[PDB]
Design an enzyme around this catalytic site. Structure first.
Site, PDB file in Angstrom:
ATOM      1  N   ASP A   1      -2.928   5.675  -4.762  1.00 30.02           N
ATOM      2  CA  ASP A   1      -2.989   4.679  -3.699  1.00 30.02           C
ATOM      3  C   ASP A   1      -3.187   3.217  -4.111  1.00 30.02           C
ATOM      4  OD1 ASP A   1      -4.917   4.718  -0.553  1.00 30.02           O
ATOM      5  OD2 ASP A   1      -3.180   3.558  -1.192  1.00 30.02           O
TER       6      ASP A   1
ATOM      7  N   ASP B   1       0.766  -1.237   0.000  1.00 30.60           N
ATOM      8  CA  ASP B   1       0.000   0.000   0.000  1.00 30.60           C
ATOM      9  C   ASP B   1       0.803   1.296   0.000  1.00 30.60           C
ATOM     10  OD1 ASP B   1      -1.933   1.328   2.778  1.00 30.60           O
ATOM     11  OD2 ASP B   1      -1.822   2.043   0.704  1.00 30.60           O
TER      12      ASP B   1
END
Ligand SMILES: CCc1nc(N)nc(N)c1-c1ccc2ccc[n+](CCCOC)c2c1
Length: 329
Positions: free
Chosen positions: A215, A31
């Protein structure tokens, strides 16, 4: 070094890492939207059903474990986890690095019972690391082994590889044409300036510019409730509790959506953003775009997640503090 990733429903992408000696295997999401590493802990009360359903790291089985114990809480847009810091050897795609990570002891059923992965491996900057813990990529870089100070992501569309993360470079096999870079508003956050958002032929959104968080840990493309209400009405989408839907037979007819990033138009087709699981006018089809109000200092910002990455191979360039996009192949 590369890591193979599994694709779960086009909403969760994860690969495996080993922790401790002998290695304890965990499914984790790489992430770029966070900066800490964490996995569920064996010290997590089993009253937390999410801990009953995931792999738990047990320090008492690792001879390379180093205690720390500092408490920490990690807050994501869709949920929260809490626990304490520990240190051990982590294995990522053949690379071995001593790393500080969070052993989670509080993992809420919603939404973690819905997670196919066990933990998360933050790929963000130390500036955003809770407890100011050194991010794993930084520690891998200090080994002076990677050819380049970068890492790239390839998220495939669902099938039946699910995805691929390359540490130190890019894989030509998964993109065509050449990259197009955009510099970060500032180092410390994988965020860039977005010059505009258009639905069909009309830049009816993000005029004057706005922010874009690239993201890899986010399932969809998100915007502020305000921005999304506007985008959606244009699509004639009906708002629900957690998502927006359209009559499935209307999916194919929905207009293109373009994001103006660093002097280049990145366009998504209705096929790119609607989960077309039917054509029936008697069924609702969800959109891979959500309203997500991200708070300061990072937000308000749009977020470009898996929905965007699926179409555009992404390279995160640490050395030059820039992000590169190319047509995913
Ligand atoms: C990977 C951690 C994470 N990182 C960021 N930057 N945002 C989130 N909302 C989450 C976060 C938290 C809990 C989830 C629970 C179920 C499913 N997801 C989506 C996983 C995304 O895979 C790419 C979740 C995502």
């Amino acid at each position: 070094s590369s890591v193979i990733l599994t694709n779960y429903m086009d909403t969760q992408y994860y690969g495996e890492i080993g922790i401790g000696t002998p290695p304890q295997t965990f499914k984790v999401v790489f992430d770029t939207g966070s900066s800490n590493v964490w996995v569920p802990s064996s010290k997590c009360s089993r009253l937390y059903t999410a801990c009953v359903y995931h792999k738990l790291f047990d320090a008492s089985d690792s001879s390379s474990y180093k205690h720390n114990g500092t408490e920490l809480t990690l807050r994501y847009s869709t949920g929260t986890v809490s626990g304490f810091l520990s240190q051990d050897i982590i294995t990522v795609g053949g690379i071995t690095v001593t790393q500080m990570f969070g052993e989670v002891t509080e993992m809420p059923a919603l939404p973690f019972m819905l997670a196919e992965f066990d933990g998360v491996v933050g790929m963000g900057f130390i500036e955003q690391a809770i407890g100011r813990v050194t991010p794993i990529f930084d520690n891998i870089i200090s080994q002076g082994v990677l050819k380049e100070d970068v890492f790239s992501f390839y998220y495939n569309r669902d099938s039946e590889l699910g995805g691929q993360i390359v540490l130190g470079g890019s894989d030509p096999q998964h993109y065509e044409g050449n990259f197009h870079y955009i510099n970060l508003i500032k180092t410390g956050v994988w965020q860039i300036q977005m010059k505009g958002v258009s639905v069909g032929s009309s830049t009816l959104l993000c005029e004057d510019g706005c922010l874009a968080l690239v993201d890899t840990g986010a399932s969809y493309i998100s915007g502020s409730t305000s921005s999304i209400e506007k985008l959606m009405e244009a699509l004639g989408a009906k708002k629900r509790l957690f998502d927006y839907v359209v009559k499935c037979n209307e999916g194919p007819t929905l207009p293109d959506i373009s994001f103006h990033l660093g002097g280049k138009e990145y366009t998504l087709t209705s096929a790119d953003y609607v989960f077309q699981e039917s054509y029936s006018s008697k069924k609702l089809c969800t959109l891979a775009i959500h309203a997500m109000d991200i708070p300061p200092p990072t937000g308000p910002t749009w977020a470009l997640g898996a929905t965007f990455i699926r179409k555009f191979y992404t390279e995160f360039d640490r050395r030059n503090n820039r992000i590169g996009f190319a047509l995913a192949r």
